[PDB]
Design a protein around this ligand. Structure first.
Ligand SMILES: Nc1ncnc2c1nc(Br)n2[C@@H]1O[C@H](CO)[C@@H](O)[C@H]1O
Ligand SMILES: [Mg+2]
Length: 390
């Protein structure tokens, strides 16, 4: 009669990390990759012998900075001359070249100099997400919903579809990341009447606030605001500067010029930062950090909170701006949704909850997984082909 249909997948194609989910048996499964990670770095590395994608690419970045590409989402659908592109290039160790006013990333790969369009790098990330899904399902996957930021224009949206097509995926739809997070909580299934939803998205490098109105399952983007210079990496930087000073006081040595020592310090700081989201203190233990000196220390959550206090408070400025742009008062917001790993920070949660006068935050779906979760819910809906009964 009719053969069973393969499940469709939902992909959050993120700037720093990507996530894939599938809706089956009335629920979403966020799919771990073969290293057991529920999110995969949006990294692609090139060597004389291999092309590495995801954890394998990110784990070798220290010694191969020129041929390990990340942040392609900051280049996708943009012109080489765009001022956003020109500023970002100063922070990247890989080469970005101008091909007819379109940026391309240029690397050494398999004995040659090769240049790739941002959509080609994103297609490599999407091929890895497709393979992660097929390893779990045990069959080939064809259909996918891919998410994008709400501020993406037509060119950025078309380049994302192009990346999906290069990866061999049929793109069912390009959906907005804040809409996908709202879908994850079933906020479009609450019936008749208007609901105002605020999505608070704090990433590794950027902060986005979106206000959506949902009426009978129809979404309208009312306002977007944010800070392009606010993210998890800024909190890591504050801990790095703190521990560099601490080593200076304790051992009368400045480590800041040994890249390996700074990198080992930063790696430890990011892990300590994650521990501090569940514990009131965290240990830092690095062996032979500099000049054979072992660095065994600690940091309280209170000290970390003080170190990043101004940065955490600054997340409320785009919230107030978005509310002014949407022409809404804070009491008129029905639902608050958290997106991004940095939203696990207790102080960030407390500041936002205090701003909305004690209101509960939707954070039950892992914030680094909510976008893929909603994309998987939508993908299963889009492939339905029910014929009405008489
Ligand atoms: N539990 C957590 N507590 C604090 N921060 C976290 C946590 N988990 C993740 Br993931 N992050 C940060 O989220 C960003 C994602 O690009 C990075 O800056 C991560 O360090
Ligand atoms: Mg995201």
């Amino acid at each position: 009669g009719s053969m069973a249909k393969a499940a469709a997948i939902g992909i959050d194609l993120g700037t720093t990390y990507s996530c894939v989910g599938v809706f089956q048996h009335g629920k979403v499964e966020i799919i771990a990759n073969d290293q057991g990670n529920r999110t995969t770095p949006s990294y692609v590395a090139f060597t004389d012998t291999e092309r590495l994608i995801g954890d394998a690419a990110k784990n070798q970045v220290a010694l191969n900075p020129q041929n390990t590409v990340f942040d392609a989402k900051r280049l996708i659908g943009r012109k080489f001359g765009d001022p956003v592109v020109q500023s970002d290039m100063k922070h990247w160790p890989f080469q970005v070249i101008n091909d007819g006013d379109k940026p391309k990333v240029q690397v050494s790969y398999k004995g040659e100099t090769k240049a790739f369009y941002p959509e080609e790098i994103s297609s490599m990330v999407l091929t890895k997400m497709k393979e992660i899904a097929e390893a779990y399902l045990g069959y080939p996957v064809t259909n996918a919903v891919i998410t994008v930021p709400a501020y993406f224009n037509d060119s950025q949206r078309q380049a994302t579809k192009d990346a999906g097509v290069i990866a061999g995926l049929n793109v069912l739809r390009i959906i907005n990341e804040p809409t996908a997070a709202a879908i994850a909580y079933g906020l479009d299934r609450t019936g008749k009447g208007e609901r105002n939803v605020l999505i608070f998205d704090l990433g590794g490098g950027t902060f986005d606030v979106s206000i959506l109105t949902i009426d009978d399952g129809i979404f309208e983007v009312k306002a977007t605001a944010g800070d392009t210079h606010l993210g998890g990496e800024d909190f890591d930087n504050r801990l790095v500067n703190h521990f560099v000073e601490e080593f200076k006081r304790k051992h009368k040595k400045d480590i800041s010029q040994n890249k390996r020592a700074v990198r080992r310090l930063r790696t430890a700081c990011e892990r300590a930062k994650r521990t501090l989201s569940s514990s009131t203190q965290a240990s830092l233990e690095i062996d032979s950090l500099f000049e054979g000196i072992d660095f065994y220390t600690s940091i309280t959550r209170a000290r970390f909170e003080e170190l990043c206090s101004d940065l955490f408070r600054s997340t409320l400025e785009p919230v107030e701006k978005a509310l002014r742009d949407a022409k809404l008062d804070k009491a008129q917001i029905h639902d608050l949704v958290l997106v991004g790993g940095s939203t696990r920070i207790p102080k960030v949660q407390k500041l936002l909850q205090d701003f909305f006068n004690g209101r509960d935050l939707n954070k039950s779906i892992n914030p680094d997984e909510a976008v893929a979760y909603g994309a998987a819910v939508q993908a299963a809906i889009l492939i339905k082909s029910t014929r009405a009964a008489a």
